[PDB]
UniProtKB/Swiss-Prot annotation, chain A:
It is found in: Cytoplasm. Component of the 60S subunit of the ribosome. The gene is ubqB. Part of the 60S ribosomal subunit. This is Large ribosomal subunit protein eL40. It comes from Dictyostelium discoideum.
UniProtKB/Swiss-Prot annotation, chain B:
GO terms for cellular component: cytosolic large ribosomal subunit; extracellular matrix. Keywords: Ribonucleoprotein, Ribosomal protein. Coiled coil: none annotated. CDD domains: Ribosomal_uL14. HAMAP family: Ribosomal_uL14. One of its GO terms (biological process) is translation. Pfam families: Ribosomal_L14 (PF00238). It comes from Dictyostelium discoideum. Belongs to the universal ribosomal protein uL14 family. This is Large ribosomal subunit protein uL14. InterPro entries: Ribosomal_uL14, Ribosomal_uL14_sf. PANTHER family: 50S/60S RIBOSOMAL PROTEIN L14/L23 (PTHR11761), LARGE RIBOSOMAL SUBUNIT PROTEIN UL14 (PTHR11761:SF8). GO terms for molecular function: large ribosomal subunit rRNA binding; structural constituent of ribosome.
From Swiss-Prot, chain C:
The keyword Lyase does not apply. PROSITE patterns: RIBOSOMAL_L6_2. The gene is rpl9. The lineage of its organism: Eukaryota, Amoebozoa, Evosea, Eumycetozoa, Dictyostelia. Pfam families: Ribosomal_L6. Belongs to the universal ribosomal protein uL6 family. Keywords: Ribonucleoprotein, Ribosomal protein. One of its GO terms (molecular function) is structural constituent of ribosome. GO terms for biological process: cytoplasmic translation. GO terms for cellular component: cytosolic large ribosomal subunit; extracellular matrix; phagocytic vesicle. This is Large ribosomal subunit protein uL6. InterPro entries: Ribosomal_uL6-like, Ribosomal_uL6-like_a/b-dom_sf, Ribosomal_uL6_a/b-dom, Ribosomal_uL6_CS2. It comes from the Eukaryota. The keyword Methyltransferase does not apply.
UniProtKB/Swiss-Prot annotation, chain E:
One of its GO terms (cellular component) is cytosolic large ribosomal subunit. The keyword Ribonucleoprotein applies. One of its GO terms (biological process) is translation. This is Large ribosomal subunit protein uL16. It comes from Dictyostelium discoideum (Social amoeba). Component of the small ribosomal subunit. Mature ribosomes consist of a small (40S) and a large (60S) subunit. The 40S subunit contains about 33 different proteins and 1 molecule of RNA (18S). The 60S subunit contains about 49 different proteins and 3 molecules of RNA (25S, 5.8S and 5S).
Length: 52, 136, 188, 205, 217
RNA sequence: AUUAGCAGUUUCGGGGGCGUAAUGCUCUCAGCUGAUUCUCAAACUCUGAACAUUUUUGGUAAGCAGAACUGGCGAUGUGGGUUGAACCAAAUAUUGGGAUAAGACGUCUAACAUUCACUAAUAGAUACCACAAAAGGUGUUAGUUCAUUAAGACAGCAGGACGGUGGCCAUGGAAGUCGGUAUCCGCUAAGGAGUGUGUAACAACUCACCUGCCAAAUGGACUAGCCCUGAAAAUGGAUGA
RNA sequence: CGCUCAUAGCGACGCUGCUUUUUGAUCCUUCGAUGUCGGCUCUUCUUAUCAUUGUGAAGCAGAAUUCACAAAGUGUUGGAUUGUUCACCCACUAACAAGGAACGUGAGCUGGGUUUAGACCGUCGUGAGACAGGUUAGUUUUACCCUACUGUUGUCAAUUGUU
């Protein structure tokens, strides 16, 4: 119930590949940036998880 | 720092003490004078001296006093000034002399204040208000 | 380039009636009436009878070819919406302040007072045609409903994006109203 | 090209045509839900008497063997173009194969999108619903009613069969509770002969 | 180089200038090592030759070469061992760079130092390649036509200009192909030293096969 | 000038090993010799041809300094390159007609038609000449080669993802999943002594792997065209507009 | 390197660029003369953005900080020492970012220095004298022309017949 909510939240914010030459937030299947500043590129990393 | 006042900050009270202004220590401490080095909350211009009206926190140094305090930049408060200013009332007040007090960076006067303290100052700093004999 | 496209067909149920004039369709169904324009080159968009609407493209580029399918999909969506409407269930969540949502169907608007302890009453008007209704399961959801998917989704998006603190860490908080079930359609 | 790739398909062809004329009787079973733990107990009883041999959609590569036998593939009951199948072979025990196959079944809750067995009852009523799980019910678009002093969506009957996908919500409900609707494993569709059908009738016992 | 941008000596200009009795002052080269992996291994072991050819005619520096080889030497342990690699580099830095320095880099003068005697002091070295010269050969097993390819890719970044990379049809450090080499081997015409085939002639060997034929592969 | 192993020495220079030990026997190892191997040159050669462009030395370079050949400029306009000492056409008594050269032919501006791709950028557009690179792009265009597929591929969606066993190592605990080494068999269409999430470690989830549904193409690694990224500078702004 | 983890942030050994805010290189213009340095004053422009705006990354829990994009719209200080740009400190500040304009700005100033003649010292020189060493004293001329700018009349010589 509560975990579901958390996962939903993550879905739109946290689970997105976050580029590198750019820092554009994309989507978990990404292999490009869709930015003509980034030059599309193929430097996608995951967006990091929470840490205290 | 702090400032916590009051709730605005007044209701400005006129430039009176530019920097390089010597004023009376008006406080139970070793200091007799207070040379004003600069005033807190002065964003500049281009050849304009920082100035302290009343209730301005003023980085200062003791020119003449006991040598335990001298040769040391230190925080103080302008508590009354000879340069007149308009209040809400309508009336223009001015005092007999330029004067400040000693204080912590937070605005804590540890001595008791000699002479009139000026209502604006009282309104601003609570500790100052407490230690005043005369606010009038 | 310039390969000659085939047709893209979309089925039409006998519940609805699809008009088309000047490369600009109009589905009419029981629920209402959606309208949409499509502007392209040599895109013959015709009716076979009252069972198939066809979209064509004589000598398409790759770009041109791509958009045909999109067009078809959009008309399918319209068809769907005007016979059995779209329903987006949005769940809202934050880990301390209870987010106060309340609908006003007179204004056709959702308003959110609390969400991060923000004392603003964050509101935005829902798009034309669509409505929300205050559905409860434990004070956790709002369910938007509509004819047009395009509008409905936009509405959802607006209240999603707005409902989010825009200062410091995005992972730490869960603040927002997010779309949970979007594939569901209102029952008839 | 053909007869290549990882873990070759050609190899499987040898099993599905040459060993399809070395047994007396057969049974066409259904494997769309049974596991490997459940199934390895039905690869000991069956293995001793015959085998479980099927490459899966290699009945169309059986047409060379149908020259003499004339075997039905699309003609028999179940055309096998909607469900997975695994043919059971037997020669020693032709009578004691139809029931021991059903003895190794194991019951469990339904899964998300599974093809599902013959019988699938959804949880409902006081036993089939909790008071804490009413929120979930409320969330759903379908109506909730008070039957027998409990808030429920009310359905305690068969709404799906073999080769019909169970709903997600229903599956979730099943998983949450301790309700196991039906015991399932390798379920016979029909009994099968060499070049014919012996009995075109289901036998779950 | 370290002293300057390599774009100063990017391209081949001037006549070749070498460490000689007419240019004795030159500093020692950055590479004094043209080795990688097991050099003791026989040519009959490793049959695959992955080269790296400079696509441009240019002055490819000693430093650059050094950088390249270590990149390959740091793509030996992460993939495979040292007993699948061999490399003679095939490009030494023979040419030496002259550098006419100036005193007033931070200081000042009214054209006192200048070019009044402009000759450059030897400082640095460089290898003068062409559009089809080999700058790194890797002899290896046939199980690495990916990893030595990717070693050499890494090297390519250390070098000026575009850099082609090629998998040969020979056994590495040998004239013969794989269809011809194999034929020789079958026939007994092949013969091995250690990391180099000799191959048994019929012109020199008219009637003296008592050493060549004895040690045939 | 320089790289590499290899053979024969190998007892030798030195380390040991080998029979209790030795200029006695064999190795790595140095040295000697032999046949192969990498690379090499203004001041090497067996051999050895035919301001501008080309050749060419110093210089990081210069619209720098210095040479060779040829042609210009200077001494020389004219047509063209928007503009211009040297570029291209082409040489200059005064004219007419003709037809051309370079170069152009939307409009400025004398001169146009037809025809096939490419470019989706605010790009790009007359050599010298007013710039631009390494390196990137699931932008598009074409091309190369390899693999898979009606034995059911590819994509999605669905089912399964087991036994020996928690193998053997090690230890608070490491039980497929901190880490070390082997990494096989059973039962199978098929399931790594296991790809991560996770757990004191587990469990649970996920992947490789196999198969159902659907139904004809699909996947990849390169290549080079244009295009995009790379690509920041001071008055306002330059494909000449 | 960053406990782990190449690329949060850094980044060897290398390589590729750009800028003309450094100093050289050169000698093309200027030696019948383009007033050198710094400061004050004033304007404009650049972006390679210090702050502020909106954003996106982070080893971003919070606060704080670092990294990047769109952005040059608005800001970017008072002082001690020094002729000093530069430098270094004190204090304020949201920040006290980097730069250009004949190294912006001498018929705008100042003349502190450099930079004539007087003079002193040190070292050098037999000496006259030298010093890119130190010290002290030492003329800053002319706009009324043209344009530019600031403002001011006035003609739109039909301000569309006149006012």
């Amino acid at each position: 119930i509560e975990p579901s909510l958390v996962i939903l939240a993550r879905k739109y914010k946290c689970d997105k590949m976050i580029c590198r030459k750019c820092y554009a937030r994309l989507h978990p299947r990404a292999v490009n940036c869709r930015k003509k500043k980034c030059g599309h590129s193929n430097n996608l990393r995951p967006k990091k998880k929470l840490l205290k | 720092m702090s400032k916590a006042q009051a709730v605005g900050s007044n209701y400005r009270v006129s430039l009176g003490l530019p920097v390089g202004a010597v004023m009376n220590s008006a406080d139970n401490s070793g200091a007799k004078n207070l040379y004003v080095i600069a005033v807190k909350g002065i964003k500049g211009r281009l050849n304009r001296l920082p100035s302290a009206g009343v209730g301005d926190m003023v980085m200062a140094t003791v020119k003449k006093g006991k040598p335990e305090l001298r040769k040391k930049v230190c925080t103080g408060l302008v508590v009354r000034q000879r340069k007149h200013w308009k209040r809400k009332d309508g009336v223009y007040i001015y005092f007999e002399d330029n004067a400040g007090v000693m204080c912590n960076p937070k605005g804590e006067v540890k001595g008791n204040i000699l002479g009139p303290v000026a209502k604006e100052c009282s309104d601003l700093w609570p500790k100052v208000a407490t230690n005043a004999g005369t606010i009038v | 380039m310039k390969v000659i496209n085939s047709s893209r067909k979309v089925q039409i149920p006998e519940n609805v009636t699809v008009d088309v004039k000047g490369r600009s369709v109009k589905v009419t169904g029981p629920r209402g009436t959606l309208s949409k324009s499509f502007d392209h080159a040599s895109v013959d968009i015709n009716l076979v009878g009252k069972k198939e609407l066809t979209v064509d493209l004589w000598f398409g580029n790759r770009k041109q070819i791509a958009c045909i399918k999109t067009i078809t999909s959009i008309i399918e969506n319209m068809i769907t919406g005007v016979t059995k409407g779209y329903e987006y269930k949005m769940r809202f969540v934050y880990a301390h302040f209870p987010i106060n949502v309340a609908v006003t169907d007179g204004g056709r608007v959702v308003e959110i007072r609390n969400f991060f302890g923000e004392k603003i009453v964050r509101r935005i008007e829902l798009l034309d045609g669509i409505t929300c209704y205050r559905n409860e399961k434990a004070k956790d959801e709002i369910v938007l409903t509509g004819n047009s998917l395009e509008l409905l989704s936009q509405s959802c998006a607006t209240i999603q994006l707005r409902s989010a603190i825009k200062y410091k860490d995005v992972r730490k908080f869960l603040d927002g109203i997010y779309v949970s079930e979007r594939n569901v359609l209102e029952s008839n | 090209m053909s007869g290549a790739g990882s873990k070759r398909k050609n190899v499987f062809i040898e099993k599905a045509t040459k060993l399809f004329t070395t047994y007396d009787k057969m049974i066409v079973a259904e494997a769309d839900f049974v596991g490997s733990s459940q199934l390895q107990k039905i690869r000991k009883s069956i293995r001793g008497i015959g085998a479980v041999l099927m490459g899966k959609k290699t009945m169309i590569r059986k047409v060379i063997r149908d020259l003499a036998d004339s075997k039905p593939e699309l003609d028999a009951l179940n055309t096998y173009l909607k469900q997975n199948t695994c043919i059971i072979f037997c020669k020693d025990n032709i009578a004691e194969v139809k029931r021991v196959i059903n003895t190794q079944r194991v019951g469990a809750p339904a899964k998300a999108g599974v093809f599902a067995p013959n019988d699938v009852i959804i949880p409902a009523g006081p036993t089939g619903m909790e008071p804490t799980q009413t929120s979930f019910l409320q969330d759903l678009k379908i109506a909730t009613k008070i039957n027998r002093g409990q808030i429920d969506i009310v359905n305690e009957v068969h709404i799906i069969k073999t080769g019909q996908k169970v709903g997600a919500s229903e599956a979730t409900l099943l998983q949450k509770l301790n309700i196991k609707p039906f015991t399932y494993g390798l379920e016979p569709k029909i009994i099968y002969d060499a070049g014919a059908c012996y009995s075109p009738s289901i036998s779950e016992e | 180089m370290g002293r300057r941008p390599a774009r100063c000596y990017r391209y081949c200009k001037n006549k070749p200038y070498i460490k000689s009795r007419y240019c004795r002052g030159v500093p020692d080269a950055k590479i004094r090592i043209f080795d990688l992996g097991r050099k003791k291994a026989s040519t009959d072991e490793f049959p695959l030759c992955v080269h790296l050819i400079s696509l441009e005619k240019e002055q490819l520096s000693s430093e650059a070469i050094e950088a390249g080889r270590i990149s390959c030497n740091k793509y030996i342990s992460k993939t495979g061992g040292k007993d699948s690699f061999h490399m003679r580099v095939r490009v030494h830095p023979w040419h030496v760079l002259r550098i006419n320095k100036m005193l007033s880099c931070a200081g000042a003068d009214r054209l006192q130092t200048g070019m009044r005697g402009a000759f450059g002091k030897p400082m640095g070295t460089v290898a003068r390649v062409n559009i089809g010269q080999i700058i790194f050969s890797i002899r290896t097993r046939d199980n690495m036509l990916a990893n030595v390819v990717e070693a050499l890719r890494r090297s390519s970044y250390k070098f000026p200009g575009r850099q082609k990379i090629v998998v040969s049809k020979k056994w590495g450090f040998t004239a013969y192909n794989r269809e011809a080499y194999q034929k020789l081997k079958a026939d007994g015409r092949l013969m091995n030293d250690g990391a180099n085939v000799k191959v048994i002639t019929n012109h020199g060997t008219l009637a003296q096969y008592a050493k060549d034929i004895a040690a045939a592969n």
